[PDB]
Amino acid sequence: MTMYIAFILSTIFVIGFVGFSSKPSPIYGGLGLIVSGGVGCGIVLNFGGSFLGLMVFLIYLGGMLVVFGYTTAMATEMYPEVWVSNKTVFGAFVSGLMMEFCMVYYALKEEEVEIIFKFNGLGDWVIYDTGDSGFFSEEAMGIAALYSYGTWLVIVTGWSLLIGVVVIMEITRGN
Amino acid sequence: KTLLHKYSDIPEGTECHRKAYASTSIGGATGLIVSAYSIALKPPASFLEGVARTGRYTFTSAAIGAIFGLTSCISAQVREKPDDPLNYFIGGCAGGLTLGARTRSYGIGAAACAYMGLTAALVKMGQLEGWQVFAEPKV
Amino acid sequence: AGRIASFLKNAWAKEPVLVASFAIGGLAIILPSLSPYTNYAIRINRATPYNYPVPLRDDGNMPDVPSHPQDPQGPSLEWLKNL
Amino acid sequence: MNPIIYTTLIMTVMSGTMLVMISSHWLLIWIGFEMNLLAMIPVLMKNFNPRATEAATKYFLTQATASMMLMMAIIINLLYSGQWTITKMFNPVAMTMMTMALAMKLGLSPFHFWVPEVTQGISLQAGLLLLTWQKLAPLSVLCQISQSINPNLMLTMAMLSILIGGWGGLNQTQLRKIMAYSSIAHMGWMTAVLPYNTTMTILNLLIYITMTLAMFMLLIHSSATTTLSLSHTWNKMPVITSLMMVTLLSMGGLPPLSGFMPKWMIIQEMTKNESIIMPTLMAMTALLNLYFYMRLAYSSSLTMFPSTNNMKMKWQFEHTKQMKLLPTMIVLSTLVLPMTPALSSLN
Amino acid sequence: PGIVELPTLEDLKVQEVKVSSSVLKAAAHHYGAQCDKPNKEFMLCRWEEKDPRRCLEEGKLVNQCALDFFRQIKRHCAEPFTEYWTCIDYSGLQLFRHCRKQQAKFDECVLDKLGWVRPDLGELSKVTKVKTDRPLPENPYHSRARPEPNPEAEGDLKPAKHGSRLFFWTM
Amino acid sequence: MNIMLTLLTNVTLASLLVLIAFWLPQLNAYSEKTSPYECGFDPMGSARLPFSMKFFLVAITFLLFDLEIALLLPLPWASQTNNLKTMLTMALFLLILLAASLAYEWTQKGLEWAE
Amino acid sequence: MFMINILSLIIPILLAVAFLTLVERKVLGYMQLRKGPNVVGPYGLLQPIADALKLVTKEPLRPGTSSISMFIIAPILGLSLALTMWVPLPMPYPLINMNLGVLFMLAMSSLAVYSILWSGWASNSKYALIGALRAVAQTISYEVTLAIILLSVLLMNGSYTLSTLITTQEHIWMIFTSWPLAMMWFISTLAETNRAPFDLTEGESELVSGFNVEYAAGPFAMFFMAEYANIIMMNAFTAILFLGASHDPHTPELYTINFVLKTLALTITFLWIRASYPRFRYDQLMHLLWKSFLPLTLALCMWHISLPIMTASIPPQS
Amino acid sequence: MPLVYMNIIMAFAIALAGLLMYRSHLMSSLLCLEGMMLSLFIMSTLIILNTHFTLANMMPIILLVFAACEAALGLSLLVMVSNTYGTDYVQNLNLLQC
Amino acid sequence: PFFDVQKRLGLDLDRWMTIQSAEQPHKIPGRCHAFEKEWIECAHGIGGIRAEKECKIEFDDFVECLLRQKTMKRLSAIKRQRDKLIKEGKYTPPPHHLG
Amino acid sequence: SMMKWNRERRRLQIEDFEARIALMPLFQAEKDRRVLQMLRENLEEEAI
């Protein structure tokens, strides 16, 4: 049902998170990350972070795009791996999908839980708050404050990208 | 952290079935720990021999873990002075000889009673006095 | 002088793109200060009310703020109506 | 690395580090680390040998992972507290979660693995930057959060660092690996006193910094990385190897040299906190440090070693290089014991 | 950790303005000019007391004035308002732009019949003072006693007795 | 409601299109028909060996470029602030820095292809 | 009835994508002293259906060396994005009115490349990898300015909502105010769709067919719609972005007729450009954009942020 | 604590397990390096939207901007892992064992 | 900070965001501005050590405001009760909870 | 032309927002009663 739709969207985020963390062929992991990234956009989009969801979507597609180019450039093998072919990644795959299965069952069955922290499974819909935003979106207006309140953050971030191009040329210079 | 807490509450010697049962657990428990790194840093070759490395290390740690409990057990009741570190002097290092026996080397086990016989004793006046290896930052 | 003008001319011939970008890019930094409407631009942003003008209690000695959102006293923005 | 950009290569490392001391916001403390991290990699490959690229990468995965754990420790604290200020953590696991990460930044626990490994490939000059400067930033965070660190956590990881750090030193012949294990052991020395008093860890940090400064100064001046190549240096420059000995004595902490005061003051403060078994244990284990200092000294100046004939070519020329400040650090890191009360200036 | 206090059902009973969005928006400007005294005192109490349960009665007062304003708009200028609010209603954002013609008829109607003035742009957004007689909330946040400050520093700095006093250092 | 309904409808229609495409047309496979195409002759044999492309340097820079396009995206909402003096200075900083990063990226070869 | 709307936004587009193929054949032919398809029905109006049935009843080739699962996902991913990226377009009243329309525009436009990416990899051939990686190279230069031009033009619109674009363009066309950006946007929209001077990824004369070499029947037929549905949608994006027509609040007919005509005029120019110029080289393409385009974007974006503040002409946010 | 915070936290947990527990590809490892950014980004975005922390809404993108910087320099470490060793598998780089 | 310069030279670089009760764009209050207002002025200049005991019963009231930990426990207990008599069928919800 | 039109749109936005704030007190006056009514019904039923 759509009532625990966020419960679902959270899950396939981690099944995709598991799939690429099982270290399959590099581009296959790229697919495993993007499905998680795509559904990961859904979770934060559900909570109201429309801009945050779109940006984590947009640039991570750009981030994963450049990853694929390098994988087939100098990081691919003449006999590529698959999630099933190698038993090691197969073992990593199967371990991941039962790890969530046994746990989300336990969390949903008892709804109190103990592991690391205490978790009331109940429903993520509960903690939404009776608030009105007026004629402005908080998720977008707060980010807009970066250029009026976060001048130091802009300076440190902007500076860092500049060396980011310096290092990306410094270490690739090849003598 | 409860496993060694469930060893302290049991008095030394008396209730030996419980005392040794604890002493077996803490002993062998460290075995999986050391073997975990031993497998980790020193690369094994197969799952069969991989658990074999855990085999001996868990075999020993359980052994010295077990024998320390029972050898310190007997001295605690027959001598009726548990609060005296000779109970863990012969109680502790006897396992070191068996640790030497477990590695088949009575030579290193000969040097075992020099050291395990010592450190086992030092834990006693730690119990009796207010010795704390990890002192809370009081000042 | 002659070298500088020639270098501009050599640029404008060899490349028309970056010089155009550098020129119009250069202007985008300077005239914002010289513009006489930039102080008006902040006033427009300030004028637009997104939150409520929460009323305040009376205790006397407050001629500036009005007692009714029609009284002559108070901040008025007929400048922006004509602007 | 182009000289002009090589300067700003190091500038952002310093300012990226400086961001860690001066910020009061957790994200900024987080930001200061990768700015240090991202700019620390290229200088490690300034020579750009296959060993250098080898050395840099193991740093990257180790350091990036440590910063990755650093991030959640902020987030869980934020989730459970809602503040970014650098104060005690309000959730125990987040505390232990940070202390685990900052150690990997620091090479305290078995994480210490990456420290000797990267030091070999990166040059002596890069090592001079690594074991000295790359430790200031994690220490500043630990000093600030010292209120709510688990005492049995920090002590255990400190005890091991002096344990493996001293013990791993008794196998090496390359001076860089020996030096890293020495740094690893000193890493444990400061961090043991971290919960009790944070003034001492600065004091031992300072003594460690100047001594490791002066130490590498001598190594560059001798231009040697293997004991045999260093063993030669008695011939060309006996003064360099003569002072090589004396600072090696400050390594072991043998009084009346400077190196005693860090160990001395820490033991005093710890004994004030009724921990006597722990300081005694590190006191014995510090002898392992001193042992490979003595052997390193033995092959340096006590006993002459076989030289060559083409080295008498070297007698004609001299060091056109200098770097200023070697004369100051030898003095500051050997004769400063009569000035123990000056530690109160740090307070 | 205590009780929860909420006035019973009979207390929060009042007929509400049952008009829709477009009706309210079309009359909003004239509604703001006319019924501001109940509005200003209600929301001033809302911000001061910081608890609706202690401000429900002012909520009753604002609804009644909203009633009377809407009651007289029906009695005299019924038809021109009907054209206004239905023409605003058609637009998907209730934009005032597509209703100037109907607004003109409504504006003059209330200008002569009910004697009203269209609030000028920016005029209605002016912050205002309200002469309410409600007492000030002494502890709006229900704050408790605060911890006393640390023992303050005083006296003059004299030389440390016997200097450093650290180990054998006599000075 | 509407958005995932729109998303679900589109993937469904696509799935049917490939389904009837891949099933209906009365297949006949004889191995060499499935053999890789190599412009008329046989493949030399690889296609998974590492295709070393020469725009690697321009590749990562694009990632850094995108990281800061996300930074300068909130400008439409940033312009509706009360401190345009600060907002204008910091905004122009990003473009100046972005040009500066490209300028270094340009002048020190960089953009040029590797041959 | 929302479902009826969904099909009413899918099927009418699909026939529009179908007839673009016939129109392109005839437009290209009549710009060639040729006649174009005119035997399949009257005036060749039956030609798309003739090709329609042939492809879906064509033998769908499965290459043995291909990775099958990734082989089939790419045609699905290509078509699914093409249709779903039509949904925020403000045809009079947009089907999906979202405050961040153009950001969603870029997201699935960036997601589109993984179609040619995974298909290029899965085909397992030399020409397959050559096309896919040059597709990276073509599209890697491409998003950096596409965002900047979108940001600079919209910065005086007011927000990222596509519906309010009409209100901004109520008085004059957007192209009058940002024609230097419009030419540059138009080249990139000509470029994002891998069309006319920038069609390296296909490259008939130099890569036989590029990524599409091992793609037949419906899997090919699907690839054609994704390419051509993106052509119409991107031109429609440009039409609203720069040539926003008048919108009567009571008769959406007026905007719909005007908007469609603008899309048709722009799409013809895509065929117009496709006939005339030769094809670039993927190195020159990257050099054209990151050496000449991108520097102009930054300054033009610099101009388009300074301009609203200096003129006290900032747009409303709501 | 709700299940949304739960399942995100558990997500970073196996991201660590993926990260340090290694395999014969450095790329796949650095894939998990930028992957664990997802959890922290999504995790962080959840709180400050939930707490209406308007100022801290820029902290995700600031975090996320620095995120690919690690990947950016990470990929450049890969290429001369390839330039000098041809391949990527993490066993040929062991000359520094000495 | 370790070496406090933000205080020294008198310029704010990161304090503006450190807390959620600080001034926000267009006065958008946080979820727990009331609690963070009270907590901050409770333990201010009194001492970190002299904070966890006295500014306690006010601090968890804030920590509950963020997480609704025992508040969500209350809802889970009530909803758990619903399942255990609705199936047993003693009680039916009033029409207010249907329509 | 844009600079004139944008300012006119700004003029409307204040006009739109002014109608919003004038109507706002009634909206706040309805919201508190509904939430208090909703809290009551849960609590009155909570006794059962």
Q: Pick from D47, D72, D74 the residue to mutate for testing the H interface (most H CBs within 10 Å).
A: D72
Chain C contacts in chain J segment 7-46 (CB below 8 A): 7, 10-11, 13-14, 17-18, 21, 24
Q: Does H56 touch chain I (CB under 8 A)?
A: yes
Angle between helix D175-192 and D260-272 (nearest 10): 30
| Inter-chain residue contact C42 with F88, CB threshold 8 Å | no
Cβ-contact C60, A146 below 8 angstroms = no
Residue of F nearest to G286 (CA): F111
Cβ-contact A3, A46 below 8 angstroms = no
Among A61, F48, H27, F33, which Cα is nearest to G128's? Answer: F48
Rg, C-alpha atoms of chain F: 25
- What is the end-to-end Cα distance of chain I in Å, rounded? 57
Q: Which CATH number fits domain H3-92: 3.20.20.100, 1.10.287.3510, 1.10.290.10, 3.40.91.50?
A: 1.10.287.3510
SS3 call for D25: strand
Sign of CA dihedral E43, E49, E52, E56: negative
Cβ-contact G96, F20 below 8 angstroms = no
| Residue at token pair 């503006």 | I16
In angstroms, the Cα distances linking J9 to A164, C35, J19 are: 42, 22, 15
Residue of I nearest to E139 (CA): I38
Q: Does B37 touch chain D (CB under 8 A)?
A: yes
SS3 call for C57: strand
Dihedrals phi, psi of A136, to nearest 5 degrees: -170, 145
Interface of E with I (CB under 8 A): 50, 141, 143-144, 146-150
CA angle B46, B48, B49 (to 5 degrees): 70
What is the C-alpha separation between D65 and D60, in angstroms, rounded? 8
* Single-letter amino acid, residue I37: K
Rg, C-alpha atoms of chain C: 25
Tell me, what DSSP letter sits at residue G245? P
Among C64, J9, C71, J10, which Cα is nearest to E117's? Answer: C71
CA atoms within 13 A on the CB side of A148: 22
Q: Where are the domains of chain H?
A: 3-92
Tell me, what DSSP letter sits at residue G148? H
Cβ-contact A39, G89 below 8 angstroms = no
Q: Residue A96 is encoded by which pair of tokens?
A: 């991941």
| Inter-chain residue contact H55 with I20, CB threshold 8 Å | yes
In angstroms, the Cα distances linking G187 to D298, E61, G198, I16 are: 74, 63, 9, 44
What is the C-alpha separation between H56 and H47, in angstroms, rounded? 10
Among D186, D157, D198, D300, which Cα is nearest to D250's? Answer: D186
Among H70, H30, A66, which Cα is nearest to F57's? Answer: A66
Can you spell out the DSSP letters for F42-111?
---S-SSS----S-HHHHHHHHHHHHHHTTTTTHHHHTSSS-HHHHHHHHHHHHHHHHHHHHHHHHSSTT
Cβ-contact C30, C37 below 8 angstroms = no
What is the C-alpha separation between D281 and D274, in angstroms, rounded? 14
Q: Does G168 touch chain J (CB under 8 A)?
A: yes
Q: Does D12 touch chain A (CB under 8 A)?
A: yes
| Residue at token pair 């009105």 | A132
Chains B and A touch (3+ CB pairs under 8 A): no
Among E141, E143, E147, select the one facing I54 at the smallest CB separation: E147
Q: Residue D173 is encoded by which pair of tokens?
A: 């012949």
Can you spell out the DSSP letters for chain E?
--------TTTT--PPP---HHHHHHHHHHHHHHS-HHHHHHHHHHHHH--GGGSHHHHHHHHHHHHHHHHHHHHTSHHHHHHHHHHHHHSTT--GGGGHHHHHHHHHHHHHSS---PPPTTTTTS--EE---PPP-S-TT---PPPPPPPPP-S---PPTTTT-STT---
| Inter-chain residue contact E129 with C65, CB threshold 8 Å | yes
In angstroms, the Cα distances linking F1 to D266, D289, E44, F104, F113 are: 65, 68, 40, 49, 49
Q: Does G53 touch chain C (CB under 8 A)?
A: no
What is the C-alpha separation between E54 and A5, in angstroms, rounded? 39
| Inter-chain residue contact C41 with G310, CB threshold 8 Å | yes
Q: Pick from J21, J34, J37, J48 the residue to mutate for testing the I interface (most I CBs within 10 Å).
A: J48
Among J7, J11, J14, select the one facing C49 at the smallest CB separation: J14
| Inter-chain residue contact E141 with I38, CB threshold 8 Å | yes
Query: E72 CB contacts (<8 Å, ≥6 apart)?
Result: E114
Which chains reach chain F with 3 or more Cβ–Cβ distances below 8 angstroms? A, C, G, H
What is the C-alpha separation between D85 and D23, in angstroms, rounded? 9
Residue E129's DSSP bridge partners are: C56
- CA D26, D32, D33, D34: dihedral to nearest 10 degrees? 120
What is the C-alpha separation between I45 and A140, in angstroms, rounded? 35
Return the CATH number of the domain spanning residue range F1-108: 1.20.58.1610
Q: Pick from G149, G306, G313 the residue to mutate for testing the C interface (most C CBs within 10 Å).
A: G306
What is the C-alpha separation between B49 and C69, in angstroms, rounded? 88
Which chains reach chain C with 3 or more Cβ–Cβ distances below 8 angstroms? A, E, F, G, I, J
SS3 call for H60: helix
Among H1, H2, H51, select the one facing I20 at the smallest CB separation: H51
Q: What is the resolution of this structure in A?
A: 3.5
Among B1, B57, A27, D27, which Cα is nearest to H58's? Answer: D27
> Cα distance from A1 to chain I (closest Cα, Å)?
19
Tell me, what DSSP letter sits at residue G316? P
Taking contacts as CB-CB distances below 8 angstroms, the residues of chain H near F67 are 64-65, 68-69
Tell me, what DSSP letter sits at residue I26? G
Tell me, what DSSP letter sits at residue F113? P
Q: Is C72 exposed, middle or buried (0-12, 13-18, 19+ CB in 10 A)?
A: exposed
Residue of H nearest to F61 (CA): H72
Among D324, D299, D310, which Cα is nearest to D233's? Answer: D299
Among J11, J36, J43, select the one facing E52 at the smallest CB separation: J36
Q: Helix count (H) and strand count (E) of chain J?
A: 1, 0
Q: Does G153 touch chain J (CB under 8 A)?
A: no
Sorted by where each starts, the structural domains of chain A and their CATH numbers stand as 5-173 (1.20.120.1200)
Can you spell out the DSSP letters for A45-58?
HHHT-HHHHHHHHH
Burial A98-110 (b: 16+ CB within 10 A, else e): ebbeeebeebeee
Q: Residue G270 is encoded by which pair of tokens?
A: 């895509």
Query: A97 CB contacts (<8 Å, ≥6 apart)?
Result: A15, A18
| Inter-chain residue contact G61 with F34, CB threshold 8 Å | yes
What is the C-alpha separation between H22 and G119, in angstroms, rounded? 29
- CA B104, B109, B111, B112: dihedral to nearest 10 degrees? 140
What is the C-alpha separation between A24 and A86, in angstroms, rounded? 9
Q: Residue I53 is encoded by which pair of tokens?
A: 């005991």
Dihedrals phi, psi of D85, to nearest 5 degrees: -65, 150
Cβ-contact D169, D185 below 8 angstroms = yes
Q: Does J48 touch chain I (CB under 8 A)?
A: yes
Taking contacts as CB-CB distances below 8 angstroms, the residues of chain F near H72 are 60, 63-64
Among I90, A123, E57, E5, which Cα is nearest to J43's? Answer: E5
What is the C-alpha separation between A172 and A170, in angstroms, rounded? 6
> Cα distance from I72 to chain A (closest Cα, Å)?
7
Q: Is C22 exposed, middle or buried (0-12, 13-18, 19+ CB in 10 A)?
A: middle
Query: G151 CB contacts (<8 Å, ≥6 apart)?
Result: F69, F72, F73, F75, F76, G301
Cβ-contact G200, G134 below 8 angstroms = yes
Cβ-contact D80, D91 below 8 angstroms = yes
> Cα distance from G288 to chain C (closest Cα, Å)?
11
What is the C-alpha separation between D279 and D158, in angstroms, rounded? 11
Q: Where are the domains of chain F?
A: 1-108
In angstroms, the Cα distances linking A29 to A101, H30, H68 are: 21, 11, 17
Cβ-contact I6, I14 below 8 angstroms = yes
In angstroms, the Cα distances linking F77 to A144, A169, F74, G271, J15 are: 6, 34, 6, 38, 20
Q: Is D158 exposed, middle or buried (0-12, 13-18, 19+ CB in 10 A)?
A: buried
User: Residue D256: is the preceding peptide bond cis (ω within 30°)?
Assistant: yes
Cβ-contact H45, H82 below 8 angstroms = no
Among I16, I17, I72, select the one facing A120 at the smallest CB separation: I72
CB atoms within 10 A of CB C13: 9
Q: Residue E147 is encoded by which pair of tokens?
A: 């911890």
SS3 call for C56: strand
CA angle B52, B56, B60 (to 5 degrees): 160
Taking contacts as CB-CB distances below 8 angstroms, the residues of chain G near A135 are 318
Which chains reach chain G with 3 or more Cβ–Cβ distances below 8 angstroms? A, C, E, F, J
Q: Does C45 touch chain I (CB under 8 A)?
A: no
What is the C-alpha separation between G152 and F68, in angstroms, rounded? 15
Query: E167 CB contacts (<8 Å, ≥6 apart)?
Result: D340
| Inter-chain residue contact D195 with B131, CB threshold 8 Å | no
Q: Does C46 touch chain F (CB under 8 A)?
A: yes
- CA E78, E84, E89, E94: dihedral to nearest 10 degrees? -130
Q: Does G64 touch chain F (CB under 8 A)?
A: yes
Cβ-contact A167, D38 below 8 angstroms = yes
| Inter-chain residue contact H81 with D71, CB threshold 8 Å | no
Among D21, D82, D147, select the one facing I48 at the smallest CB separation: D147
| Inter-chain residue contact D82 with I17, CB threshold 8 Å | no
Cβ-contact I1, D21 below 8 angstroms = yes
What is the C-alpha separation between D122 and D51, in angstroms, rounded? 7
What is the C-alpha separation between A74 and F114, in angstroms, rounded? 15
- What is the end-to-end Cα distance of chain E in Å, rounded? 59
Among C53, C80, C83, select the one facing J21 at the smallest CB separation: C53
What is the C-alpha separation between G294 and F110, in angstroms, rounded? 15
